[PDB]
Design a protein around this ligand. Sequence first.
Ligand SMILES: NC(=O)c1ccc[n+]([C@@H]2O[C@H](COP(=O)([O-])OP(=O)(O)OC[C@H]3O[C@@H](n4cnc5c(N)ncnc54)[C@H](O)[C@@H]3O)[C@@H](O)[C@H]2O)c1
Ligand SMILES: NC(=O)c1ccc[n+]([C@@H]2O[C@H](COP(=O)([O-])OP(=O)(O)OC[C@H]3O[C@@H](n4cnc5c(N)ncnc54)[C@H](O)[C@@H]3O)[C@@H](O)[C@H]2O)c1
Ligand SMILES: NC(=O)c1ccc[n+]([C@@H]2O[C@H](COP(=O)([O-])OP(=O)(O)OC[C@H]3O[C@@H](n4cnc5c(N)ncnc54)[C@H](O)[C@@H]3O)[C@@H](O)[C@H]2O)c1
Ligand SMILES: NC(=O)c1ccc[n+]([C@@H]2O[C@H](COP(=O)([O-])OP(=O)(O)OC[C@H]3O[C@@H](n4cnc5c(N)ncnc54)[C@H](O)[C@@H]3O)[C@@H](O)[C@H]2O)c1
Ligand SMILES: O=c1[nH]c(=O)c2[nH+]cn([C@@H]3O[C@H](COP(=O)(O)O)[C@@H](O)[C@H]3O)c2[nH]1
Ligand SMILES: O=c1[nH]c(=O)c2[nH+]cn([C@@H]3O[C@H](COP(=O)(O)O)[C@@H](O)[C@H]3O)c2[nH]1
Ligand SMILES: O=c1[nH]c(=O)c2[nH+]cn([C@@H]3O[C@H](COP(=O)(O)O)[C@@H](O)[C@H]3O)c2[nH]1
Ligand SMILES: O=c1[nH]c(=O)c2[nH+]cn([C@@H]3O[C@H](COP(=O)(O)O)[C@@H](O)[C@H]3O)c2[nH]1
Lengths: 385, 385, 385, 385
Amino acid sequence: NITIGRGKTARRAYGIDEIALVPGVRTLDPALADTRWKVGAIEREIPIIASAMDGVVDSRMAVLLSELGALGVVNLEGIQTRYEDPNPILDRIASVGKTEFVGLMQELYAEPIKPELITKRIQEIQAAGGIAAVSLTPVGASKYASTVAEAGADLLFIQATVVSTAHLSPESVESLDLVKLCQEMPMPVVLGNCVTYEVSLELMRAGAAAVLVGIGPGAASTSRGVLGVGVPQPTAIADCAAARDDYLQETGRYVPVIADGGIITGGDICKCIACGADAVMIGSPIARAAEAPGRGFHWGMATPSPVLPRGTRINVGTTGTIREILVGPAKLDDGTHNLLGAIKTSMGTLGAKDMKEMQQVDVVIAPSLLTEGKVYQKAQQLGMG
Amino acid sequence: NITIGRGKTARRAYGIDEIALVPGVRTLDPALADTRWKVGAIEREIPIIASAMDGVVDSRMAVLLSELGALGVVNLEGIQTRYEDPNPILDRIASVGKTEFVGLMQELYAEPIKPELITKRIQEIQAAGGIAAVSLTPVGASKYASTVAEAGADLLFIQATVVSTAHLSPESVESLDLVKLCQEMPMPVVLGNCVTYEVSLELMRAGAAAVLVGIGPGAASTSRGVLGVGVPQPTAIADCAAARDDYLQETGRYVPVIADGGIITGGDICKCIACGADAVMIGSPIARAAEAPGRGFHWGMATPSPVLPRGTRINVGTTGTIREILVGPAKLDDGTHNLLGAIKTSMGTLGAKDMKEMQQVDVVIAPSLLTEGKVYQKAQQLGMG
Amino acid sequence: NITIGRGKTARRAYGIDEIALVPGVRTLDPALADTRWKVGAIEREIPIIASAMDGVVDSRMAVLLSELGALGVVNLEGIQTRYEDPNPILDRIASVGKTEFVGLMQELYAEPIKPELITKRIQEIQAAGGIAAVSLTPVGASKYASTVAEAGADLLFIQATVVSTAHLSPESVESLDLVKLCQEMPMPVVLGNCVTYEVSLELMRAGAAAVLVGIGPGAASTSRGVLGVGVPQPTAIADCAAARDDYLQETGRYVPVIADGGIITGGDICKCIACGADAVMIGSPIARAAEAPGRGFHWGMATPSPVLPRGTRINVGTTGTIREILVGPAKLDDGTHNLLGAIKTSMGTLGAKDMKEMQQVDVVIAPSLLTEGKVYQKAQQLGMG
Amino acid sequence: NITIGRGKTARRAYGIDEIALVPGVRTLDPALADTRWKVGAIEREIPIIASAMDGVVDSRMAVLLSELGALGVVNLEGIQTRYEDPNPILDRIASVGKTEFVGLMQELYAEPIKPELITKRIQEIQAAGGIAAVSLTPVGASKYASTVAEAGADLLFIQATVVSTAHLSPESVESLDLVKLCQEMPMPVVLGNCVTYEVSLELMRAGAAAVLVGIGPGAASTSRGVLGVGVPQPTAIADCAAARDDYLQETGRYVPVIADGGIITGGDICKCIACGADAVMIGSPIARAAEAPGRGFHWGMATPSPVLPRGTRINVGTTGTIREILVGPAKLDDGTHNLLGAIKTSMGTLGAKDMKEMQQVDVVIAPSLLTEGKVYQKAQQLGMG
Ligand SMILES: NC(=O)c1ccc[n+]([C@@H]2O[C@H](COP(=O)([O-])OP(=O)(O)OC[C@H]3O[C@@H](n4cnc5c(N)ncnc54)[C@H](O)[C@@H]3O)[C@@H](O)[C@H]2O)c1
Ligand SMILES: NC(=O)c1ccc[n+]([C@@H]2O[C@H](COP(=O)([O-])OP(=O)(O)OC[C@H]3O[C@@H](n4cnc5c(N)ncnc54)[C@H](O)[C@@H]3O)[C@@H](O)[C@H]2O)c1
Ligand SMILES: NC(=O)c1ccc[n+]([C@@H]2O[C@H](COP(=O)([O-])OP(=O)(O)OC[C@H]3O[C@@H](n4cnc5c(N)ncnc54)[C@H](O)[C@@H]3O)[C@@H](O)[C@H]2O)c1
Ligand SMILES: NC(=O)c1ccc[n+]([C@@H]2O[C@H](COP(=O)([O-])OP(=O)(O)OC[C@H]3O[C@@H](n4cnc5c(N)ncnc54)[C@H](O)[C@@H]3O)[C@@H](O)[C@H]2O)c1
Ligand SMILES: O=c1[nH]c(=O)c2[nH+]cn([C@@H]3O[C@H](COP(=O)(O)O)[C@@H](O)[C@H]3O)c2[nH]1
Ligand SMILES: O=c1[nH]c(=O)c2[nH+]cn([C@@H]3O[C@H](COP(=O)(O)O)[C@@H](O)[C@H]3O)c2[nH]1
Ligand SMILES: O=c1[nH]c(=O)c2[nH+]cn([C@@H]3O[C@H](COP(=O)(O)O)[C@@H](O)[C@H]3O)c2[nH]1
Ligand SMILES: O=c1[nH]c(=O)c2[nH+]cn([C@@H]3O[C@H](COP(=O)(O)O)[C@@H](O)[C@H]3O)c2[nH]1
């Protein structure tokens, strides 16, 4: 309904920083707020998945997250499957200057994937009592999905900027048949990323166990600057949640919508749930953990592209343990600790008893939410500033 | 009427910095502008209440405010009822670094409330000739409202982020029956906070003497970042003023709407009145007084939460006496002094003879109000910048 | 047509920085662009009036401006009529620190007006061959309009934040009858300021020779922060130009609309003309002249209020002579020199042959006009940044 | 459809930073994306033209660009035709301080054009195997178009802020008849700049081989500040592309629309194509080449105006070779290298097989595209910040 100019129309899309949540007609104690989600047969108390990023998730973090009631995804195309000991490599990435990290990563990530390390990472996480969740790009799945199946991973994430049931490739590159993959894999398969109703619906029809929503909102993402592609998160989430609801009516199958990236605070999580997300996928808030493999740094997994980097490396620092970050007690005033407590406290304030009710809360378009009254916080770099 | 995406709608809400006031067809000398408001049987010449915050109101400030024609609320869950001498505690809060205040306050605020100090603060304010206005959260009122009644306070404020007539609690926590409280308390009971028509109407129907509007606009507030909850002030005020007007038609009872927080200048006050407020509640402008207990600092009363802080500590400085701040003469060029003079001068410019007429002034949506022509003021940190 | 909330409506108003001018179907050489305006019987080639501000206009500047084809207004309530030699006073104002100027001006401006100096300033400007244009507030005109008439000034400006035909005053203050003033004064009387159709129409009906539009856009203005009052300039200008056009149809009399303040560049002037202005009143761009009495500083004329300052002092610097600023050749790349050349070049680009055609150019709402492509200019403080 | 005020209407126009591109229902490998464009009989693989700016294009750069599959335009009114050896002049421009470059350029650019150097630049580019593309303003073409024709240039660009078929000039200045020029020139003639449907259609009807769209988006442009004139790029491009499509239906002739200026990244290019552009004209990204004549600086070609400069000089630095900037491999994370790879990767993501399909991609209005999640990148001056 918007005219850009003669013969070119558009629709308005809203970002995470443009919306706010409105109380209902009841309130509830946060201890009564049910935050569960489920993917396949796996129920989780914390509706947070740590991103498949080398500054965020290694084997230890995947286990720690699982034990807290959350999940972490190991990237099978990152350093974890290229080096038997990733630690010196992670140290090098964290130690070089702002003008050196692109070139360094272009080199370090050229070391080949060792399929024996795909098996090892999965089996060590499972041996330790963790849920083993692993990612591959569509081309990576053409080569290694059978290795993941043989290893017996609990969840497979096929994730890239876009993942399509209608991908055109030169005949030398094996395009991935997502319908065949979902049917043949012995575990649930999460597909993404997408930002539209039409694509999310197609991914669900192909057999996805969950869909990942988001193109470019990430803190370490440069895709929107490199390509111009993206839909801001509230709008993308709502459109994909509508596809979930239509797919549920058509088949009786519930495919959760995961809002992926661009989340820093508990308020950001809540705003994503209120737009329809069943769960969120976050990286930068978890890269701030004492146990995070990034050593206080966080980088995009397309930063090492040898031809066109589409991520950067940022310094997020280290603010607490992963336990403090997910379940507190919070040590900070900015909503970046005790993320589960923040979700339950927000649901309580809004009267939302469970995640489905949270997705039904009233929303306002409120670009002044993060700026009204905040001049001192911005000037002094405190609180929200 | 706004579509965020398929199946998710919203409405636009406007912040304090997005609106402006338009002159009418007459003007009047500021000396002719009537700024009075009334709560219960208490008439006040200055339609300003100092927030129940430990950097803003102690016993002395409550008396000084009362004598100037305003009001101040003592927080009965803060340091004033936990320590017989709050001064060394206030000094410690003001003296620690930006990375220490959360942890310090989490500890200092764990000292138990002394019910004898609730009685003492009320009686010392009254003995000194002040109006004794005190606050409790709903749980705090379940424990101490009978102590407040026995002490004979002039006003009770039941205040929290949200206060509900429909609160769900585990059975070990006593939910507060607001209808019973308003009926049984011997003094007027102010309830808040809220941001919607439906809740404000319910609070009025429960017996509120006034309603407090605002979730997260505060200068020392981090709730919007932690939770994602809030409605920007102009929209919240207007919706709650509509509830006041409907309640007045239904019962003949007038329940004033108090716009609470996010106000720095006289223009901010005026914009809140123009959206329907009968009075404003402000903290940071009063924390700048020479007599303010915060020693030039101002912190949110949820900063000391042991599990999830939802306020921060800011440095507001000290710019004048409380008399200069409320009634001048102003020493500054930025509208943060002589707040009563600013209200009367604005009402004069607009032709508003009284507060009810001020609530009826024409408003524009004008995001350029605070930026048009202001490049030098912003660059040089002068005036409005 | 905008809902702020239930029972509170608004309209959208646009600022100078939100609009842009669109070419027509012809272009013309700038030498062919007619920039004239007329007030009373006084025709001017340059449609710029220097503001009645003590950093901008003294007797010499009033003459220099007149001789260039522009105008300058001497404030008869400022330092020029309080001190026989204003120079040491102007030096003191320019020399004190950012924390001292309010208090200093509150004192310096308390020196009484000398009616002999009203006569002297007028007669010296006229003796020197300049057009003598002088300002008074409505109360100042009750006391001194007969002195201005006796001295034989060429134009009288009755100017304040608001000037009303319906002003309510205590009986000890003489309200000014604008109808009587316009009828009795022997010279044209310019009235302002206003921002609405209704008030501008009333000022025209009272006998105004021109109306001044603008509340708070000024570079040295703090009224919008102190009071919350104002309408951004494009909207205010358009509404007042509609009153001009209706008054012309009703009476056959043409009353020019002067856009007053918030202009820094030639583009700002052009945008104001395109919204309906016949001329502009500017201060800060002229305070940058080598001959400006402000010595590189520029302050609001309500900064010296002893009770509620509503202006500030800014440092504008000195960038050229008044000739360079109005007619070039320009020495700068930012459109703050050769303002007449900028108007003619803009009119040429748009195909506007005269000021009336410039007022009819197509406009877009374009908040990206000043930011699109400008990242380097902003970062390096060059050009538009 | 927008009301600025009574009697003044406007339409909303959108800038490059306000839009985003939405995936379709298929994706394709970037190697399959066809990026070609054509002007006259000249087909180009890279749909990028380097701006006719002295910091961007000299003879060597024109040849290097041609050989890479792009184009570069030599400005025949710049230093290249005024000095036999431009190098010492370019060195002087790059070496002076921020307060000196306007005055320096006003002097250096006053050296007369040598028509022998127009012939020489054209013939040296062609002798070296490059496509010789040259620019003149309309007045410059009245004097030198016959010299360009005699020299046998491959493309002539008649370019200025505006170029009109209906230009009014004093009789001492020869207005250019564009219809006669296009008919008589032996090579294709590109005309611009414009931002409207009506003007672009007239330029096409006059015989333009392509039209240049854009007034003031440039990184080194100050025209919008000096004049207030411009339409943000997405809206201007769409309106002019509608004129192209109508002209094609009326005549069967296809006139490409070139989006000119304000582009820094590959995403900026893609957003311009998606609004209807067949190709883009860029300066600042190419001024960052090791081979760029600006020595790391980039200035507007109206900066040297002796009366009213309408450009500035910025420091863009040097980030790679022109090969790295256009075709990679990229060394940076911000989308300013491998611009062709960025276009093909964006087209791939969107399912666009060719440039015409790219012009048909769905667009959202998304002011949060460049800010959502980007706080660390902005704070640390990394990636998109
Ligand atoms: N969500 C984002 O915005 C984003 C952007 C960049 C990178 N990443 C992250 O970085 C990593 C790499 O992602 P990437 O997009 O850079 O990877 P990539 O460039 O290696 O792979 C993605 C490409 O796969 C292709 N594709 C889509 N469906 C396919 C199919 N069925 N068969 C074969 N190919 C198909 C597309 O051309 C797509 O651009 C992932 O961990 C990912 O989460 C995310
Ligand atoms: N206005 C705001 O945005 C805001 C936000 C945070 C804190 N505060 C301030 O800080 C202090 C503490 O406020 P807080 O919200 O952090 O307090 P809190 O967390 O101790 O209490 C609030 C909680 O009380 C519960 N509640 C609502 N109605 C109830 C009822 N009838 N019975 C029992 N419980 C009920 C809700 O769960 C609500 O979240 C107050 O002085 C308050 O003004 C204000
Ligand atoms: N345009 C603005 O936004 C603005 C704002 C502040 C100051 N100023 C400038 O500063 C100077 C002083 O202006 P000020 O507004 O501070 O002056 P001021 O405060 O002395 O006088 C203005 C007051 O005069 C009264 N008024 C209106 N009509 C009247 C009438 N017919 N009779 C008697 N009184 C009437 C109003 O109460 C109005 O607020 C002027 O040079 C003026 O241009 C301009
Ligand atoms: N696109 C822009 O926003 C912009 C702005 C300023 C400068 N420039 C660049 O700087 C250089 C000079 O451009 P300029 O606009 O400063 O040049 P300029 O000022 O020398 O010439 C432009 C003037 O030519 C006139 N014109 C239009 N059609 C004509 C016609 N048929 N006959 C005769 N005159 C006609 C107009 O008065 C127009 O303003 C060019 O390289 C140009 O690309 C671009
Ligand atoms: O544009 C991108 N370039 C990258 O290099 C990249 N790496 C990760 N991702 C995505 O970012 C999500 C994490 O977001 P945060 O860093 O904001 O937590 C992740 O979950 C991914 O969706 C990238 N996006
Ligand atoms: O989100 C919040 N967290 C806190 O810790 C907090 N403490 C006070 N308040 C509220 O802020 C109001 C004062 O606002 P100012 O500081 O802007 O004057 C007060 O009147 C309260 O409404 C808080 N809000
Ligand atoms: O709010 C105000 N407080 C003041 O103290 C003041 N002094 C001048 N003016 C007005 O500003 C106009 C000049 O505007 P610039 O400084 O932007 O040129 C002038 O022409 C006046 O309209 C003031 N406005
Ligand atoms: O307002 C202007 N003043 C100037 O002095 C000027 N010089 C060039 N141009 C235009 O800018 C385009 C290049 O844009 P970038 O620098 O953003 O690449 C170029 O292609 C031109 O359209 C100018 N625009």
